[PDB]
Amino acid sequence: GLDSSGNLKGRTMRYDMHGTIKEIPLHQVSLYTSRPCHIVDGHGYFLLARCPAGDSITMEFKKDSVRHSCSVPYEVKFNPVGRELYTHPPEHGVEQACQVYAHDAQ
Amino acid sequence: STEELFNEYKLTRPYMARCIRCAVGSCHSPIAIEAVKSDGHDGYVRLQTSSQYGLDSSGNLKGRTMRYDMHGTIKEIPLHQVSLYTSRPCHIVDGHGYFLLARCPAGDSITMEFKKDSVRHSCSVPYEVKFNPVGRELYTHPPEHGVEQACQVYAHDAQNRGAYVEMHLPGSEVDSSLVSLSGSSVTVTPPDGTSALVECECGGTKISETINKTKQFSQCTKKEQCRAYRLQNDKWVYNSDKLPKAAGATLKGKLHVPFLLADGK
Amino acid sequence: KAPSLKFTAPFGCEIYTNPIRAENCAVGSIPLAFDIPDALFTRVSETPTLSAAECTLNECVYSSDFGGIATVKYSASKSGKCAVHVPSGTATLKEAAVELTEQGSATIHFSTANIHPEFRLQICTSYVTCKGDCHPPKDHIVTHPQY
Amino acid sequence: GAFGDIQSRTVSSSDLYANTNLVLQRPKAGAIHVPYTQAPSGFEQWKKD
Amino acid sequence: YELTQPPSVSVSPGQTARITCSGDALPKQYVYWYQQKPGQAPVLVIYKDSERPSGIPERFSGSSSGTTVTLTISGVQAEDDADYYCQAADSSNTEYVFGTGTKVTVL
Amino acid sequence: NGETPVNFNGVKITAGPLSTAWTPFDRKIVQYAGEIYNYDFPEYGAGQP
Amino acid sequence: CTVPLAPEPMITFGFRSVSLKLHPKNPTYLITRQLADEPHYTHELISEPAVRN
Amino acid sequence: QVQLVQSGAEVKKPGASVKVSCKSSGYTFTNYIIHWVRQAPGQRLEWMGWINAGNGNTKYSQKFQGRISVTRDTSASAAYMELSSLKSEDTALYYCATLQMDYGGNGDLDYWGQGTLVTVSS
Amino acid sequence: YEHATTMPSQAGISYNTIVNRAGYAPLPISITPTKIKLIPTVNLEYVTCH
Amino acid sequence: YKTGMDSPAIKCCGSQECTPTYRPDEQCKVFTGVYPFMWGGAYCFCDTE
Ligand SMILES: *[C@@H]1O[C@H](CO)[C@@H](O)[C@H](O)[C@H]1NC(C)=O
To answer: What is the domain-level CATH number for residue E42?
Structure first.
């Protein structure tokens, strides 16, 4: 959400490298569990993304020529809504109440 | 190939269609996937996409190119810049017209991506892709050797077989960017050399089809009051269910389906 | 979890929340106690008096809904309103009241489970005896409870 | 949903008997599309088993 | 910025006549042809650059080619004599400019 | 409830009491996502891993 | 959120019997209960085409 | 119909300021721009400026700076054009321009006023 | 006048009855239960989450 | 089979009627109260009907 200086930016990830704080645009940061993940937004220490089901999650980026990657074995779950078990959200159907990680940072 | 195969595809335009999962949320993508056919055997699929293949934005053949509609402008990208994957990366064999022949593994959905200027365009649709082994040994990746058996695969030829799809007259697509606001007055400036049907419901209904350069409708105070549909209706479009329908007689011809399923070993 | 109560409740109850309610449970009976002032009541002289009434079952099927029509020929003293009712449980009447004229025929929709129905239809004052034959309905399964 | 859900007298015949429980559903709010519902193809199901 | 227009024209009755107007920003602007009878206010005869309002005689027509616009009167009568102006706007779409005017002469 | 009248136009109606005391909910219930479950949850301070 | 809508069951009626022919596209839950004192509820997950009486 | 009524013709010595009123009615007067146009006898029509009656915004010609000043009031629904520093060449007829039809904007101005004549005393 | 009737608690089904007096015209009473609710009194024992 | 769909016919502040069926398993439906939303903003200026 903000750069190394400490000023608001649009979509920027700032990270600590050996004592000094650096920044990189969020579109250079990639994420995947078993298939590529799509990042919705980021704020502070937290990142909202859209991920398929998988047994681990990996986050990568590339700064100069070195790929910084981190993979953790935290199960990622896909939870269908209703009484029809789907793995990908349908293009059409009926509206049902669900709970989703809202895209707001309030 | 020459222009014999593209004789009917040079009268067509790409379109922008709704995608339920497009990078962030559901939007109107330039590469919206209409259908995925995976009835062949060795993991070959034939996608139907809103974008168009084999010819450039001007309408002339370019070898491996995807031209896509973007907010009314047909733009181009090399075919090697487009990525496809279902559960693992796919490999694009070829593309002709609205159709794309690719080699994909099995998956519960299919995702198509490309980045043109700075943003990433993606469309993921929940169309199941199936891998069908040939014979009585249920492999998942085709073997390096064995014995040849007859099979049906989506061929790598775009020749005119008996299958066809219809080309129709495109419906008028609304564009809110045309309607700007001079001082307390709406003003419609259509794209250079193109008409714009202004349908407007201020005090007194307005139907001003024939505006070509500019027109100020001082009766209106706010832009959101009323609309300016963009009339092009010179290039014909596929009869997609994700586009509005143009009134009257709409059918205009037939487009042959390339990469049809064919016998081989 | 196992299915919720809205899927596993007896008597067709519908479970709702905020507040936690069970609606439309088809169990038990409600006793009603009525205290009616005499103002609503009307004397026998004021109401029309029925005479020369005959009931014919021109159509009857013993279906769950009102699968029967009874036509009564009447020669009443005057026009008015009649509280048509069957004291017996043989038939259930769709209409609790029927308009009445000087002379004519009145149609009443009733539902019965009897293959050969015979009941005493009560009208403003008379007690007509209605009989006939009913026939099995078309539908094996319907979408409403039996009346 | 079973073999022969769609039937054509010959390959080139212009007639086609189709019975697939095609049912049209209400479009999602703010979306231009034709949502439909029908039984999965009977030919594919027959091929499966 | 000014819309050039010939001073006057002479055409015999029962003969079509042309009135020509030109401008630098004309191809991206709409021409409005105004007819004025001497002694009172002008009356619009052509709007939207191509088609006349309701009640105007059908002999009037208009067209635009390139940076020029022409107003054609088929079979001019005696009552067609009046000031004929071409109206448009500045290249910045902020200043309204009228034409010089053509004195059509009918015998 | 047997106790309460409802009055209208001079008419009094005293509905109740219900013939059957049967209820779908048992003593201990659980509400989640707008649905009610008959669950014998542990008492407060008596939960188990 | 939008959830799918399973294909309409094909229902045949017989004397005190209902036969449902079901062709799901996704693993779909069929829940069933009698509107009586004993619901005898059934709760099944159906993936392949099925006929349930 | 739509009516545009102006004051009668009057004569002012050059060097003064001329005041011309223009009452208007008959349409959806919330947003319509009224144009002031000047015509010399037997000469070209000259567009001086326009006023947005509903909003109050004004625009003047390039060579009409300071000397021209237009205004309006909501109560009388009338423009109140003021032109200071009259000259001999200012002798001309003044017209109000607004559109009866239902499209509005540039050029489309159907009904005009009778105009006010300004000259110098003989 | 006092009456004591009893009706089935089936929602959506009308129920008709007649009242008779020695010297008065019979009068009809129709009751239609559109919705019958059962609201137990609930005490929030506790709340459990992840 | 292939389920073909015609492009939706959208009418703003209006009503439409179903064309008679003439194609295999063809069926039509008119949904009222839609607010289509194209890529260039809302398609209709008309909140309902
Ligand atoms: C009962 O199921 C069988 C197959 O299991 C089916 O053939 C029959 O039609 C069903 N009963 C009825 C009444 O349809």
So the answer is: 2.60.40.10
| Residue E2 within any structural domain of the chain | no
Tell me the CA distances in angstroms from B176 to B197, B247, C19, H106, one per residue in order: 12, 22, 46, 21
Which of A27, A34, A88 comes nearest B126 by C-beta?
A88
Q: What angle do CA E39, E45, E46 make, to 5 degrees?
A: 145
By what method was this entry solved? cryo-EM
CB A56 within 8 A of CB A72: yes
Out of G13, G15, G19, give the residue to mutate to test ligand 1, the one with the largest number of ligand atoms within 8 Å of its CB. Answer: G19
Cis ω before C19 (30° cut-off from 0): yes
Q: Which of G2, G5, G10 sits opposite D21 (nearest CB)?
A: G10
Query: Could you list the residue range(s) of the whole structural domain that residue A67 is in?
Result: 1-106
How many of the other CB atoms lie within 10 Å of CB of E24? 14
Write out the two tokens for J31: 């949904």
Q: Do A85 and G26 touch (CB under 8 A)?
A: yes
What is the position in ligand 1's atom list of the atom closest to the CA of G53?
1
- Domain range spanning residue C109? 42-131
3-class DSSP state of J47: coil
Q: Which residues pair with G18 in a beta bridge?
A: G13
Number of domains in chain E: 1
For residues D22 and J28, the answer to whether their CB atoms sit within 8 Å is no
Q: Determine the 3-state secondary structure of E2 from DSSP.
A: coil
Domain span at E98? 8-106
Domains and CATH numbers, chain H: 3-119 (2.60.40.10)
Final resolution, Å = 3.2
Q: Chain A: residue nearest F34 by CA?
A: A97
Instruction: Assess if residue E52 is contained within a domain.
Output: yes
E48 sits in the region (left: phi over 0; alpha: psi -120 to 50; else beta) called left
CB pair distance less than 8 Å for G31 and C9? no
Give the one of E41, E47, E98 whose C-beta lies nearest to H44's C-beta: E98
Q: Flag whether E43 is in a domain.
A: yes
Q: How close, in Å, is residue D34 to chain B by CA atoms?
A: 6
Within 8 A of G41 by CB-CB distance, chain C residues are 3, 7-8
Q: SS3 letters for chain B? A: CCCCCCCCHHHECCCCEEECECCCCCEEECCCEEEEECCCCCCEEEEEEEEEEEECCCCCEEEEEEEEEECCEEEEEEHHHCEEECCCECEEEEEEEEEEEEECCCECCEEEEEECCCCEEEEEECCCECCCCCCCCCCCCCCCCCCCCCEEEECCCCCCCCCEEEEECECCEECCCCEEEECCEEEECCCCCCEEEEEEEECEEEEECCCCCCEEECCCCCHHHCEEEEECCCCEEECCCCCCECCCCCEEEEEECCCCEEEEC
C-alpha–C-alpha distance, residues B55 and D11, integer Å: 33
Q: Chain G: nearest CA to C98, how far in angstroms?
A: 35
CA-closest residue to ligand 1 atom 13: G14
We report the CATH number of the domain holding residue A90 as 2.60.40.3200
Taking CB atoms and an 8 Å cutoff, what residues of chain G touch D25? 5
Tally of CA atoms within 13 A in the half-sphere of E57 that contains its CB: 11
Nearest-CA neighbor of C30 among F28, I13, I7? I7
Half-sphere exposure of E41 (CA within 13 A, CB side): 22
Place of tokens 């009525």: C34
Name all residues whose Cβ lies below 6 A of ligand 1: G 12, 14, 17, 19, 51, 53
Q: How many domains does chain A have?
A: 1
- For chain D, say whether B260 makes contact (Cβ under 8 Å): no
Number of helical (H) and strand (E) elements in chain F, helices listed first: 0, 4
**Domain CATH code at residue C76:** 2.60.40.350
- Classified as helix, coil or strand, D45 is helix
3-state secondary structure J16-44: CCCCCCCCCCCCCCCCCCCCCEECCEECC
